[PDB]
Amino acid sequence: IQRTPKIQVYSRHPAENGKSNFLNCYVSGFHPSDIEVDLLKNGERIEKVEHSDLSFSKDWSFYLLYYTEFTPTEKDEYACRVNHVTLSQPKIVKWDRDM
Template sequence: MLPPPPGNHSSASCYTGIPKVQVYSRHPAENGKPNFLNCYVSGFHPPEIEIDLLKNGEKMKVDRSDLSFSKDWSFYLLVHTDFTPNGVDEYSCRVQHSTLKEPLIVKWGKFSNSFLSC
């Protein structure tokens, strides 16, 4: 079992962290130019989480990093996929976690990458 996180917690299982979500492209987006779409989710606990990248509301095939944890025992994970922006399709990241009452959806914007902290 992991040692407890900092603070007055008797065990790591008592600690909860709400996910922070960042949706961004690897390179500046250009219509018709292949790129990579990333959804980086951090600061969450417990580690069970569901993260999906969506294209027009439909799940995309993704790759994901290994689940890792920070010094404060919160977890982080990167989900990513290749995509080609076209100015029409909408992309977003959907996160489902026990600390959220409903799924959190963060949209990606071509001219401003999306960062959301709860």
Template sequence: MRELICFTLFCLVFVTVQGKISTPKVQVYSHFPGEYGKDNTLICHVSGFHPPDITIDLLKNGEDIPNSQQTDLAFEKGWQFHLTKSVAFKPVKGEEYTCRVRHMKNQNNYAWGEFYVSVF
């Protein structure tokens, strides 16, 4: 029993030492080139972060977009994690689409904007 406790403590210390705090890298994009009034998918991919204390929200004009889907949390080499959240949407001129990412105590918004939309 003592060996099991020592092994568990060793694993916890090893994971803690190996996983240094890393801020997330965030990419906000759409599945297809943006066109107003056309069905599309808004995607927010967050990678390279540790620890895995993170929340991702997809927003339209500052309000949560319902029915979003999120992948399972996965890790990469060096105990850095990645996560993707997406939702079906139809871009409308003048509306703001953002990805809000909270990692630990830090929160930032990342925009998907008009420079992604074709007006033709």
């Protein structure tokens, strides 16, 4: 039983340039639990990334929230990069202030 992860990238609060915020990558619905999640700023890995404690849903699939403080601006591209044993290549979901 293997399950590919679902990904959402988003901010805690609505993005206002210059104001401190939190960049979130929520990965859910995957199995098994080993997963690689990086948060990217203009293609480069952000180093101080934290994540929630591993848990799972009624169907036994895991979910995790990766997050880091960031101050959004214009032209500053942000993204979440996810790899898992069910993915032949890493998956990248860009952050869209509008979702």
